[PDB]
Structure formats: structure tokens, C-alpha cells
Design a binder for these strands. Sequence first.
RNA 1: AGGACGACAUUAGACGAAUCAUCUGGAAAGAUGAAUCAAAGAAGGUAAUAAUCCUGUAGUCGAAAAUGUUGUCUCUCUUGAGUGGAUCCUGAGUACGACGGAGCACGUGAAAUUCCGUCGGAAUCUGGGAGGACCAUCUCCUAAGGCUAAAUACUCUCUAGUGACCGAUAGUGAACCAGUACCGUGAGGGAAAGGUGAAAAGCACCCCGGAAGGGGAGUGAAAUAGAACCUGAAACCGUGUGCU
RNA 2: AAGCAGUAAAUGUGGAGCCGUAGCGAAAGCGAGUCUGAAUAGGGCGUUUAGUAUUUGGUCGUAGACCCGAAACCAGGUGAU
RNA 3: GACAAUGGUAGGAGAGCGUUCUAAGGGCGUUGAAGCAUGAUCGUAAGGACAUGUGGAGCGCUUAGAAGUGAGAAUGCCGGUG
Lengths: 42, 131, 199, 60
Amino acid sequence: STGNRRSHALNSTKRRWNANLQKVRILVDGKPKKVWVSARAL
Amino acid sequence: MKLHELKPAEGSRKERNRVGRGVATGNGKTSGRGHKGQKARSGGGVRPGFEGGQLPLFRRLPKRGFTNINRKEYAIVNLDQLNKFEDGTEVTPALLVESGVVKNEKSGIKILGNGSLDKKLTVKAHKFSAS
Amino acid sequence: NYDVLKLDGTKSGSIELSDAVFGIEPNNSVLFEAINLQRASLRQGTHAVKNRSAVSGGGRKPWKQKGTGRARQGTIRAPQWRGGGIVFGPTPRSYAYKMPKKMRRLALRSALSFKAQENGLTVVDAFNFEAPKTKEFKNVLSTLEQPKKVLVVTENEDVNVELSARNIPGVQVTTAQGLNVLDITNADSLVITEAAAKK
Amino acid sequence: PKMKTHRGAAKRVKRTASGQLKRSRAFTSHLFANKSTKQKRQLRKARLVSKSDMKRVKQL
RNA sequence: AGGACGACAUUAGACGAAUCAUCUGGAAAGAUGAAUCAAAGAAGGUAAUAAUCCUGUAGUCGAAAAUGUUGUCUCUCUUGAGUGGAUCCUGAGUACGACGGAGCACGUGAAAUUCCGUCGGAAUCUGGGAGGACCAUCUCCUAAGGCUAAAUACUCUCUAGUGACCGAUAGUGAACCAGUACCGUGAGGGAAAGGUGAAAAGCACCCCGGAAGGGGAGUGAAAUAGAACCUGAAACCGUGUGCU
RNA sequence: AAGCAGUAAAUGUGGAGCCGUAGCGAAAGCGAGUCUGAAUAGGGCGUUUAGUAUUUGGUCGUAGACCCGAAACCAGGUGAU
RNA sequence: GACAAUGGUAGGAGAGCGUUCUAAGGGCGUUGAAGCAUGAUCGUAAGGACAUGUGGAGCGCUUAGAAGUGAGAAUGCCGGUG
Ligand SMILES: [Mg+2]
Ligand SMILES: [Mg+2]
Ligand SMILES: [Mg+2]
Ligand SMILES: [Mg+2]
Ligand SMILES: [Mg+2]
Ligand SMILES: [Mg+2]
Ligand SMILES: [Mg+2]
Ligand SMILES: [Mg+2]
Ligand SMILES: [Mg+2]
Ligand SMILES: [Mg+2]
Ligand SMILES: [Mg+2]
Ligand SMILES: [Mg+2]
Ligand SMILES: [Mg+2]
Ligand SMILES: [Mg+2]
Ligand SMILES: [Mg+2]
Ligand SMILES: [Mg+2]
Ligand SMILES: [Mg+2]
Ligand SMILES: [Mg+2]
Ligand SMILES: [Mg+2]
Ligand SMILES: [Mg+2]
Ligand SMILES: [Mg+2]
Ligand SMILES: [Mg+2]
Ligand SMILES: [Mg+2]
Ligand SMILES: [Mg+2]
Ligand SMILES: [Mg+2]
Ligand SMILES: [Mg+2]
Ligand SMILES: [Mg+2]
Ligand SMILES: [Mg+2]
Ligand SMILES: [Mn+2]
Ligand SMILES: [Mn+2]
Ligand SMILES: [Mn+2]
Ligand SMILES: [Mn+2]
Ligand SMILES: [Mn+2]
Ligand SMILES: [Mn+2]
Ligand SMILES: [Mn+2]
Ligand SMILES: [Mn+2]
Ligand SMILES: [Mn+2]
Ligand SMILES: [Mn+2]
Ligand SMILES: [Mn+2]
Ligand SMILES: [Mn+2]
Ligand SMILES: [Mn+2]
Ligand SMILES: [Mn+2]
Ligand SMILES: [Mn+2]
Ligand SMILES: [Mn+2]
Ligand SMILES: [Mn+2]
Ligand SMILES: [Mn+2]
Ligand SMILES: [Mn+2]
Ligand SMILES: [Mn+2]
Ligand SMILES: [Mn+2]
Ligand SMILES: [Mn+2]
Ligand SMILES: [Mn+2]
Ligand SMILES: [Mn+2]
Ligand SMILES: [Mn+2]
Ligand SMILES: [Mn+2]
Ligand SMILES: [Mn+2]
Ligand SMILES: [Mn+2]
Ligand SMILES: [Mn+2]
Ligand SMILES: [Mn+2]
Ligand SMILES: [Mn+2]
Ligand SMILES: [Mn+2]
Ligand SMILES: [Mn+2]
Ligand SMILES: [Mn+2]
Ligand SMILES: [Mn+2]
Ligand SMILES: [Mn+2]
Ligand SMILES: [Mn+2]
Ligand SMILES: [Mn+2]
Ligand SMILES: [Mn+2]
Ligand SMILES: [Mn+2]
Ligand SMILES: [Mn+2]
Ligand SMILES: [Mn+2]
Ligand SMILES: [Mn+2]
Ligand SMILES: [Mn+2]
Ligand SMILES: [Mn+2]
Ligand SMILES: [Mn+2]
Ligand SMILES: [Mn+2]
Ligand SMILES: [Mn+2]
């Protein structure tokens, strides 16, 4: 969800990045099927 | 003024200059020649090539400031002050009565901050006040 | 300065109208600027014309810049082209402007007193119908163009409307112009007393 | 649009007509010229107010 | 949280005042005579320039129907206040911190106020937050759930108007069967081109000619208005020539 | 001024606001004076009253800002007949 | 009435002419408007009239207002014709 932003470095020049979130395989709750899982939740 | 004989006030109104309409007019280059009398025309805004609109700086500012009534408070009748916001004073961050002129009346000077000489003259007449 | 009020033929009484409204002895320069102002305001500014950014053409370079033997060009819609964009035409805009209040009041007295130094008749009257008796009610002498000034809105009196030269407003009305396109006026009586009251 | 005021005139202050001005070489290299040093005093413009005129001018 | 009895408005319309004569004319609304209406002298039309010739205009009247909006009855749904303070309850991976960002007029800066990712991670009304780092005090609030009309923005469209806006190289690209001829494989680019006359009365008939076109004879106020049609400038092309 | 009223009005309302009647200092602040200064020296700015609203003309700024012209940059498409 | 001054580019300043629209007033027009053409006309200039021919329905004038207000040059754009 979102996270697009600049990546200023040293000279403070900007180039766009992504701010990627953590994710992993999971057993799930709603129906026993493998699912992406947000790390901060577990 | 009879609407077909309107006549505008003497010396008001004068025909605008129209550049670029002929040569006898005195304006066909229009104005300038060869230079940056080009359309963009930017002089620069106020500059040469050596920035003298800057040498060093000195500054700061906090909250303050009053509103001056001089001992020409000799206009109004007798007694009272601050009320004269209905006679002769307008916007007041706070109202100080200064000296200057020479007082000619006996009256209460109910005001915030009295200038010293003014206090001696107002008190030499009769009344004084504070806050 | 007693004005000799009268009613529909024969003389009636008299009234002393204030001399610093009806006897200002007009200041002309203000009256001019007022007239020009009011005309300024009646103008709506609906003229507009399409500059090159606006024209329903494109902006390919019509031909490559060098080696053609033609002049260089930018768009087929640049201003020298037939069909091209207009440079600096009219655009929509405000036209009307403000004037200081006292000047407006000075102007009003000036127009009225101009009307007094020549002629401007008075009459207490009015009726409850709708007739071209008003034309027959210019048995009161009264000339070609004029306004009927009146105390407040008086529909019927106002329906002396479609009689060519006549015009007929209130007194809290009272334009600088209508007043002196006018040639003759007739503040009635109540009204005359109010314009007298609203200096 | 109201003209923007130049902000680099946080460097003068209006007198009565004329603008009072900062001076010269205060701070750095004080290891030189001594009578010079007592040049804490004001300024104006004269020739230059012609150039800077209407920029420090919403400073009234 | 969905539906039954009439007011007004929208979608056809109806009524609507008062002029005649002569001159000039192809034709009069013009001119000059006398008249008249007006809550109607706005506008457009009619053979020239019309308040009274026509369409209308001021004003008045009008809806079987179908939406549309509302007045009020029906229809539902509804128990609103105050004291007391003992133990519960007031939104947990949140507020907040660190790091890399991003947003606040405010460029990391003394940087509060607020969002993102990533690890860390609280308190429990003797509580929590804010008051431009931060701490004490004081004052003001009660985050981490949700909904909420009106004032505001805009005009492809509808009806009614307006303009010291254009008047056919202007004004829409487009007043003409224009996004069309035409051009490109395609996305796409894109013109030129309005005007006979009041009325087609658009030239019966004779003539030269295969026809085109023309001269008579005719229509017309005018065709030296004949259709490639009002006016018809200039470049340019011709015939005649007074002086050379 | 916005707003309210009025026929897209010259026009009544609205005194929030703005400029002006006081200046000087970075400021606290003092005030016909104030700043620097130990100084009641000298010096700087200032006092010896005229402004303010509307507006024709001149000029500047912000806007493409007299007009026509790049080679080029970027974004989104369309093309391997 | 004497008496001075009056070449002039960039450029400053001044007075004006003409165009379209508007307001008010005042007029002209089928017994012929505008436009077009022609003339031996008038004013210091821009520029103004007049008469005749064409044209066949609109137009001046005064005073003030406001402008898409003046072309000979842009290898300018469109049309016509050399
Ligand atoms: Mg500086
Ligand atoms: Mg192209
Ligand atoms: Mg090119
Ligand atoms: Mg006859
Ligand atoms: Mg009426
Ligand atoms: Mg008519
Ligand atoms: Mg093409
Ligand atoms: Mg191709
Ligand atoms: Mg092409
Ligand atoms: Mg011909
Ligand atoms: Mg020859
Ligand atoms: Mg100006
Ligand atoms: Mg733009
Ligand atoms: Mg690209
Ligand atoms: Mg192939
Ligand atoms: Mg002329
Ligand atoms: Mg004539
Ligand atoms: Mg005839
Ligand atoms: Mg000749
Ligand atoms: Mg001639
Ligand atoms: Mg003739
Ligand atoms: Mg003629
Ligand atoms: Mg005709
Ligand atoms: Mg004439
Ligand atoms: Mg004028
Ligand atoms: Mg040329
Ligand atoms: Mg060439
Ligand atoms: Mg050509
Ligand atoms: Mn950047
Ligand atoms: Mn001039
Ligand atoms: Mn010159
Ligand atoms: Mn040049
Ligand atoms: Mn130059
Ligand atoms: Mn220039
Ligand atoms: Mn440019
Ligand atoms: Mn610069
Ligand atoms: Mn474009
Ligand atoms: Mn491009
Ligand atoms: Mn060539
Ligand atoms: Mn165009
Ligand atoms: Mn100050
Ligand atoms: Mn030295
Ligand atoms: Mn009828
Ligand atoms: Mn009728
Ligand atoms: Mn008749
Ligand atoms: Mn007609
Ligand atoms: Mn009606
Ligand atoms: Mn923090
Ligand atoms: Mn941070
Ligand atoms: Mn930031
Ligand atoms: Mn916080
Ligand atoms: Mn604080
Ligand atoms: Mn809560
Ligand atoms: Mn919401
Ligand atoms: Mn419409
Ligand atoms: Mn066109
Ligand atoms: Mn034409
Ligand atoms: Mn093709
Ligand atoms: Mn026709
Ligand atoms: Mn014949
Ligand atoms: Mn005939
Ligand atoms: Mn032809
Ligand atoms: Mn015709
Ligand atoms: Mn023709
Ligand atoms: Mn209103
Ligand atoms: Mn001293
Ligand atoms: Mn001194
Ligand atoms: Mn001094
Ligand atoms: Mn200007
Ligand atoms: Mn300059
Ligand atoms: Mn400019
Ligand atoms: Mn000379
Ligand atoms: Mn000489
Ligand atoms: Mn000049
Ligand atoms: Mn004309
Ligand atoms: Mn032009």
C-alpha cells in the first residue's frame, strides 16, 4: 500500500524509489489456503 | 452639462501614446535599437553583474507597539479619555498620550502609558491617569 | 428659496426647497466624471477574440526550417497567416470603476441644481388606474423629454411608461444621467421633500 | 498580482523618504585597518535607489 | 425505513388595443395633410424608413395526460429528565521512539503540528494529548470507529434573454450536407466555397451556329440585375487615337 | 472591502480593513526626540504638521507582455505492408 | 508693430488629421445613401469639400466616450494577375 517517494543522497539530489513492504507465505484464517502475509501483523 | 455638450475637466485626460504607428509620430523602431529592446526584454529586475543590493544583514522582531495621542488633547471639552476613539484617534494596539504642543485644559487622561513630559503638563493643569 | 408648487393646470401653494441641494450652483467637472462613470458601468464586456493558443488548428512546423526557399514558419495559426491567431484583441473585462462617495453626492446636487437654474416643476398628485391621461396631464406645460420623480415606487404612475420621452423613478433612485438627459424634471412634493432630506 | 517584495532587503529600513543601510565589512578579517574599524554608521543609496526603487517599497 | 388525498411549476396553446388621404415612385412604412391607440412606442416582416398592414408586444386565460416540487392528512418509529460516588468501562501492535522517506508557506534545520515502510513499543481519569525543540506550571482539549445538508466549483445539454462582440481573408476548423474534398499504412493533419430579383415574372417568337455563344423581339424600376448573376477597385490584357 | 438591497446600473448600505496626524534604535524601550555614548559631549536619523480616495498620461514589476523564427527536451500514443 | 529663433539620426516633449463603434443633440436620403470612377477644388501637413457618371439603401454633422485605429518592405500568410 503506497510508499512511492524520493531517495535523496548526500548531494540531496532526488530519484524516485518505492519503500517496499515485507511479505511472506501464510496458512491464512478465512479458508485454509496459502496467502501473502504482512509482517507487522504476525 | 447637457449630455451633447459634455466637457471634461481642464487638464484632466490626455491621449495615450501609440508607438509603432508611423515615423512622423516619432516612434517606429518604437524604442531602443539593436540591444535587449527585444520582446522578452528582461533587464534582470534590478542588477549589474556584481550584486550590490546585498552587503550584510542586521535584524530581529518581537510583539509590541502603541498608538500616539499628543498633548494636542486640548481639542476635547473636560474629563475622560479612551472614549475619544469617537472624536480623533483610529486603530490602537494600545493608547499612549505623548507630549508636544502645550496643554490648555483640565481633564482625566485615562490611558495606557503616559509620556513623561505630557504627564507633567496634564498634571500641571489638574488630572492624571493610568491603565 | 420658495419653489411655486402647483397641480395639473392652475397654481397651488408653495414650498421652500433647501438651497444646498437645489441651489448648489453645479460643479461641472464632478458631474462629468459621474456621467462617464455611469456609462462606464452600463457596459458589459462580452467581446473576446481567439489568440494563437486558441485557434482550432495545430502546430506542426509547416515545413522544415532550412533549405526550402520559403520563409521560416511556426504554425499555420501564427498571426501573419490568414486563418491565424489574433494578437491582442479584445477580451472580457470590468469596464466600471468606483468614485468617492461625497463626489457622488456633489454630483447629484449639481445635476439637480443645474435643473433648478433652468426649469424643474413641482406637483403633489397621483391616481389609481392606468391611462394616457398622463400625456393629457402635460397640460401642466412640461416639455419633451423628462422624468417624473416620485416618493416611493408608484405602479400606475409608473405606467405612464410607454410614452416615448417620459421616464419615472423613485428618489432614492435618481441617476446622474436620467436627471440630465432630461431637459425638465418634476419631483412631486413628498419626493421633493425627501431629496431635500437626503442631502 | 501585488509585486513581491524582495526579501534580501531585510538589509535596509525606511527613514523618511530615504532607506537606512547596513555597512561594509563587519565580520571576518578584522586583523586589518583600525580607524577603518569605527565605521559602524549608516548609509542610504543616492545613485542606487534609482536601481532598487520599487522592490523594497511595500516597505513604507 | 417504502406507500394513499390537492396547490404550484415543466412539457402543446388561446386572447390580445388603434389609419386614412394626396405627392413621388416599380413598389410607399418616406413627405405633406388631417386622425387615433398605449399596463401594448420590445422586436421581426410586408415591393423603400410602420405604435395603429401582418407576426407579435403589455396584459389576461389555459393541461387528457406524463414527470417535477411542495402545503396536510394518513404511515412508521418513539420514555425523556436528576443526585450519588465505591469497583468496571470509555476504540493495543494503536499513540509514541529509532531509521529511510514524504507532507506542513516552513529546503533537517532549534523543527512542534501529520502521513508512509521497517524493526522497537505505552499508559488506563491521581489517566492520555496539545499549547512550534524540551522540562516544570497553568490553560485548553479527549486521538487511535463511522455518517452528516447549505453557502462553494463546473456547463456537453435545455428554455428565456443580453452585448460602445465578428460581419464571409472576420466570427467556430466548419454561415454553403466539415471533421467533409484532399493527404497519410496508421495515430493523425484538413481546406476552399455565402449574396439574381419585390416577385422566376429565369428571356415566347425570329435570326447566325452541330452546339457553344450571340443580335433582335420580350419580362423587369433596373438584365450596361441573364444565372459564372448586387456593388464590381487594383494589378494584368486589349481596340481607338490628340501630341510625340 | 466582501456581503445585503437594486433591473447583470451610480448607489443606498457595510468602518473589518487601509493610508495619514511621530520619530529613533537589532531589540527591550523611550518619545519631539532618540540612537551610539561614562558624558547633561560630538555625530546619525528626526521635530518646525498635509494628507487621502478616485482617476487621464508616463514608466516598472507579474504575466507569452511588441510581432514572426530554432537546432532541441519531456510525456502519451501510432507505425516492421 | 518692431525684434530674435526655426538642418537633424537614437531619443524626449507638444499639437493635430483620418478610421470603426457608442451617447446626446441636430440633420440628409429612392426628387437617389454608402461605395466606385473622373475632375483644372480647398487647408501649413495628415487631410476636407464640391460637381458629374455609376450605384440602388443607407449615411453624415456637432460635443464627449471607447478602440481588433492608420502597412511598403518581415526569403511574412491567403488570392489574383504578370
Ligand atoms: Mg543580503
Ligand atoms: Mg503535421
Ligand atoms: Mg520549423
Ligand atoms: Mg402615378
Ligand atoms: Mg410596462
Ligand atoms: Mg418595424
Ligand atoms: Mg495535409
Ligand atoms: Mg508517413
Ligand atoms: Mg499531413
Ligand atoms: Mg462583369
Ligand atoms: Mg498604338
Ligand atoms: Mg497609471
Ligand atoms: Mg497561458
Ligand atoms: Mg519519450
Ligand atoms: Mg513481412
Ligand atoms: Mg470620411
Ligand atoms: Mg451630400
Ligand atoms: Mg427614378
Ligand atoms: Mg484624367
Ligand atoms: Mg477624388
Ligand atoms: Mg442617374
Ligand atoms: Mg454619387
Ligand atoms: Mg431597396
Ligand atoms: Mg450630410
Ligand atoms: Mg473621441
Ligand atoms: Mg509584401
Ligand atoms: Mg520568395
Ligand atoms: Mg501568390
Ligand atoms: Mn526536484
Ligand atoms: Mn499625442
Ligand atoms: Mn526620432
Ligand atoms: Mn532593426
Ligand atoms: Mn539598446
Ligand atoms: Mn521593446
Ligand atoms: Mn518572445
Ligand atoms: Mn536576478
Ligand atoms: Mn494548440
Ligand atoms: Mn510539440
Ligand atoms: Mn526564391
Ligand atoms: Mn479564425
Ligand atoms: Mn521602525
Ligand atoms: Mn588599507
Ligand atoms: Mn392574436
Ligand atoms: Mn394588433
Ligand atoms: Mn399609405
Ligand atoms: Mn425592408
Ligand atoms: Mn405576455
Ligand atoms: Mn517526534
Ligand atoms: Mn524522520
Ligand atoms: Mn518536508
Ligand atoms: Mn506529540
Ligand atoms: Mn510553547
Ligand atoms: Mn475516545
Ligand atoms: Mn466522509
Ligand atoms: Mn439561446
Ligand atoms: Mn471563415
Ligand atoms: Mn465581401
Ligand atoms: Mn487516402
Ligand atoms: Mn434573394
Ligand atoms: Mn433588346
Ligand atoms: Mn419594361
Ligand atoms: Mn466574377
Ligand atoms: Mn440589392
Ligand atoms: Mn455584377
Ligand atoms: Mn445582490
Ligand atoms: Mn546632544
Ligand atoms: Mn542631536
Ligand atoms: Mn541634525
Ligand atoms: Mn501601462
Ligand atoms: Mn528604467
Ligand atoms: Mn511592456
Ligand atoms: Mn527642427
Ligand atoms: Mn537654420
Ligand atoms: Mn513621446
Ligand atoms: Mn459605414
Ligand atoms: Mn491593425
